[PDB]
Amino acid sequence: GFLGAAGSTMGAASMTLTVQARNLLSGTVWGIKQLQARVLAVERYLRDQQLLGIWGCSGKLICCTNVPWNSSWSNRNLSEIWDNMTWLQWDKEISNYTQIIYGLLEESQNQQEKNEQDLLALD
């Protein structure tokens, strides 16, 4: 269900990716209460949708990138993350590099990628 795998491992929590993006939308004062909330609800959806878009993905759920993992980012092995760890605990670590990693995606990639495609599309 909603936040079903929230406590499961990150590799297991990859199954509930469909549930989180699904319920992320849901379709005289005291009526404006819900208005201003559901306005922000849209804005929160589009923030991530734009980030997802301006990066190497723009398709939802999963995408890969050409950014190499900086191993000072608190490195653990592939079995020490997906099958040893939960996403919330994971967000409790890379929180510092979150703003840092995001930048490498939008500029260092898609601006590089789609311009790399410009000079190779001319023929």
């Binding site: 269900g1 909603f2 936040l3 079903g4 795998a5 929230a6 406590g7 990150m10 929590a13 509930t16 990716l17 469909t18 549930v19 989180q20 993006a21 699904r22 992320l24 939308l25 849901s26 005289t28 004062v29 005291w30 209460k33 819900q34 909330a37 559901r38 922000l40 609800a41 929160r44 959806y45 991530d48 980030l51 997802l52 190497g56 993905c57 759920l61 999963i62 995408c63 890969c64 990138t65 050409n66 950014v67 190499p68 993992w69 191993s71 980012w73 490195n75 592939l78 997906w82 996403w87 919330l88 994971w90 967000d91 890379i94 979150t98 990693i101 995001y102 490498l104 995606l105 790399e116």
Partner: protein, 450 residues
């Protein structure tokens, strides 16, 4: 390894946001021209989802939960916005020619009412209206030939009457998070309201909460599971309130044993003041009953729990209010649209070392009130003729502790309250709002193409 973005990951963190309300389908059908607020709200979910978050532990803090604050501000606004299109009684500040109850035989509660005759405006700006009404002592104050009187708010604020259409009757209200946000719900049986919960759930809406406004005693609320539960912000800080939640409910029976009269006095054009006519009955002070044995079973169970915090074998004392505004020195609540103020000396007057009829509280009824420590909107509640009786469940207490310690020797407890925020906390303790952030980025052995 390469960075990989994942959308819709179960990530959240504590946040404060603007919530929305739900109130069944049944609370709208009540109608009567929008009783309470339910006119703009959306429906409660028929099949609300509560999902257990397997293997999830989350910290909660019931004392720093913005849901409480939002509810408080909402009900303030609600009261504010429901009294504005209603009748405005500002001309009702008029010299009141007022005598004691004439009485008869003999004396029990004497000055509880007055007979107050006043010059009043009709529909027209010319001819006055020399007419009268009944008023309680709590409503009216003397200022210095028979005695001369005025309304108790006249030097404080502005009066305007509750519209007889709407009705102050709590209904269950659910509070819900918008998209991108969620409510987490702690399900552990023994929980003080602050710390890590082992059984956490997520819901779209809270349970239905009746916004019952009262002091000293919590009425019709949720009870704690298996055992009476104690919740306090700082047990060694004598300035901090102590919230108690019961396991077993205690029936409380209250009555206004006076049939009354609704005398409609026209202060037009269009504005109709409902005066208090007379008394049909014997002249009787209202009262609330609790079962002595039942109250005693409760006190036995409450005391034992308190000793776990204050230590193993100490004297626990219950005493009456220390003083303060009327709102905090009585048990105040409403019944049949009427405002009761009840003497709780009979409730808080006992000493419990570690090892049957009715309790009657000498209540008093005030008609003019301005809660929430607001100064500048006064409200008048019109009399509701007939026998007024109500029965509620006492489900909790708001207590204070004396500061003169006696720190490891004995403890003394008194009813307290006054900050209505403490009422909301007792139901919302198991909820907190968090925001969702479906992005997350992770290393793996996958890389994209050229």
């Amino acid at each position: 390894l390469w960075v990989t973005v994942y959308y819709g990951v179960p990530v959240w963190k504590d946040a404060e946001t603007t919530l929305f309300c739900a109130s069944d389908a049944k609370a709208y059908e009540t109608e009567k021209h929008n009783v309470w607020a339910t006119h703009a709200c959306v429906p409660t979910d028929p099949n609300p989802q509560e999902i257990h978050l397997e293997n999830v532990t989350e910290e909660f803090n019931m004392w720093k939960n913005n849901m409480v604050e939002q509810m408080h501000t909402d009900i303030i606004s609600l009261w504010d916005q429901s009294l504005k299109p209603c009748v405005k009684l500002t001309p009702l500040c008029v010299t009141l020619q007022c005598t004691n109850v004439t009485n008869n035989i003999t004396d029990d509660m004497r000055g509880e009412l007055k007979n107050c005759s006043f010059n009043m405006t009709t529909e027209l700006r010319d001819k006055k209206q020399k007419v009268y009404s009944l008023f309680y002592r709590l409503d009216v104050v003397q200022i210095n030939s028979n005695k001369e009187y005025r309304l108790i708010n006249c030097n404080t604020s502005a009066i305007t009457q509750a519209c007889p259409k709407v009705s102050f009757e709590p209904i269950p209200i659910h509070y819900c998070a918008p998209a991108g946000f969620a409510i987490l719900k702690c399900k552990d049986k023994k929980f003080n309201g602050t710390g890590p919960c082992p059984s956490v759930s997520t819901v779209q809406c809270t349970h239905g909460i009746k916004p019952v406004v009262s002091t000293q005693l919590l009425l019709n609320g949720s009870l704690a599971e298996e055992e009476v539960m104690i919740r306090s912000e700082n047990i060694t800080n004598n300035a901090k309130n102590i919230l108690v939640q019961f396991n077993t409910p205690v029936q409380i029976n209250c009555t206004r044993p006076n049939n009354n009269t609704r005398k409609s006095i026209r202060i037009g054009p269009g504005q109709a003041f409902y005066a208090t006519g007379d008394i049909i009955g014997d002249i009787r002070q209202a009262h609330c009953n609790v079962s002595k044995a039942t109250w005693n079973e409760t006190l036995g169970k409450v005391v034992k729990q308190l000793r776990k915090h204050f230590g193993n074998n100490t004297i626990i004392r219950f005493a009456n209010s220390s003083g303060g505004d009327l709102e905090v020195t009585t048990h105040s609540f409403n019944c049949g649209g009427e405002f009761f103020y009840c003497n709780t000396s009979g409730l808080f007057n006992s000493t419990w070392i570690s090892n049957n009829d009715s309790i009657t509280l000498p209540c008093r009824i005030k008609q003019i009130i301005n809660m929430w420590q607001r100064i500048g909107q006064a409200m008048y509640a019109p009399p509701i003729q007939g026998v007024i009786r109500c029965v509620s469940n006492i489900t909790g207490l708001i207590l204070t502790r004396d500061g003169g310690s006696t720190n490891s020797t004995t403890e003394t407890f008194r009813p307290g309250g006054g900050d209505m925020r403490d009422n909301w906390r007792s139901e919302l303790y198991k909820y907190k709002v968090v925001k969702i952030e479906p992005l997350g980025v992770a290393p793996t052995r996958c890389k994209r193409r050229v």
